[PDB]
């Protein structure tokens with residue numbers, strides 16, 4: 075069934091699973107036309123497909139050409155997401171294929187189930203977690219590859235950098251979700267926290283800075299403070 | 312006109328014959344039903360006064376043989392049987408008729424209800440859904456499950472309706488996933504009509520049979536089949552005009568006949584609201600929409 079706080083350790087067991095977030099697939103800017111009407115302009119998007127145990131991120135870049143001449147783009151985007159996830163599964167060796175795919179939005183359930191009919195043993199599940207994966211485009215290196223793309227492309231990343239050398243996947247996922255929630259809540263302030271110390275850099279082959287264990291504790295505290303600060307500002311608390 | 316004589320009525324029972332029903336008292340001098348219109352299938356059905364559990368009954372066509380009902384005190388039900396001695400059968404019927412021990416099928420001349428509910432229903436197709444080849448009539452009851460229900464337990468006692476599953480490989484061509492899921496025309500026209508049913512008459516016959524089993528027996532799997540066959544048409548953007556017009560007629564008479572007080576258990580709110588207000592055919596079922604909005608506005 076649905077995945078929630080009760081069965082949270084399930085995410086880090088040895089059954090291969092993927093989260094799929096479609097938030098950033100269909101992205102637009104809204105603007106006025108010369109005649110005073112409103113029009114949209116699509117920009118490149120991405121599918122965020124993540125193994126929460128290993129950190130492997132399959133970032134499928136959705137180039138704006140896939141929308142050309144198509145109607146009902148918000149609906150199509152869900153089917154295109156499901157088509158691409160299905161294609162990814164088929165591309166993986168059998169022993170790497172997931173046993174479960176967890177969609178972050180319930181509207182992805184039917185599209186994905188229909189595309190995965192050939193895989194009756196792969197469970198397609200929703201979640202009651204509110205996950206901040208929409209903020210993936212606040213990670214500078216991910217935003218850059220998406221915006222620079224001139225054609226459809228798949229790029230592989232490890233969203234945990236080398237953290238799993240020192241921490242468990244439960245702790246890594248918790249760190250990731252705290253960072254992404256802070257980036258979603260106040261992107262400017264979160265990036266300031268992450269980059270305010272020029273002596274701590276992001277390796278060429280990494281997404282996040284090279285913090286020591288003690289420095290990660292400080293950063294995590296500051297991210298929590300940011301989220302609480304923004305909560306107080308929002309609700310006048 | 313034809314006749315279904317009864318050996319006796321040893322237990323008090325409500326007897327249905329098509330859309331009609333009447334009560335028989337324990338050991339009342341009742342010996343059957345006469346004046347049954349030739350040319351249609353019929354259903355004779357039972358609900359015991361002392362045990363409303365198991366509604367059950369028999370689909371039959373008097374053109375296929377001479378049938379009678381005899382109570383079985385071992386199995387505890389009214390059983391249909393076939394009499395192969397025609398001379399003997401005509402004699403038994405004539406005696407019951409002279410002694411006025413039979414009720415008359417109470418058809419009003421103006422009334423086409425039964426024809427309208429069974430227009431496409433044929434006994435030969437009933438006998439393929441309900442498999443018991445040694446008899447020319449078919450037993451159905453309230454508890455019989457369908458083949459689809461069983462896949463999700465005795466196969467010999469099942470309702471072999473055509474399996475319809477919108478999220479199945481049969482319904483969805485590889486490479487046409489969004490297309491086929493949002494517009495079921497392929498599944499309706501190529502898979503179901505051209506492939507399995509061969510024509511719309513057979514499709515409507517199964518739809519009509521499913522409705523009647525739902526209504527007369529409270530058979531839940533039959534209700535599911537009836538709604539699935541409606542939804543498949545309504546969810547197809549390409550349907551022959553003559554099928555849509557005929558469906559509107561079929562559904563109108565079904566909604567008209569449904570007991571008002573069973574609407575809560577026999578009508579699926581989701582399917583009807585989708586079909587009448589959201590589907591491709593939301594504007595193609597004018598007569599059914601009108602009766603539904605006037606008779607069951609709550610459901611909508």
Ligand SMILES: O=C(O)[C@H](O)c1ccc(F)c(F)c1
Nearest residue numbers: 316317318378379394400403
């Ligand atoms: O009298 C009998 O032989 C049985 O009671 C019986 C046998 C066949 C029938 F058609 C019928 F109505 C009654």
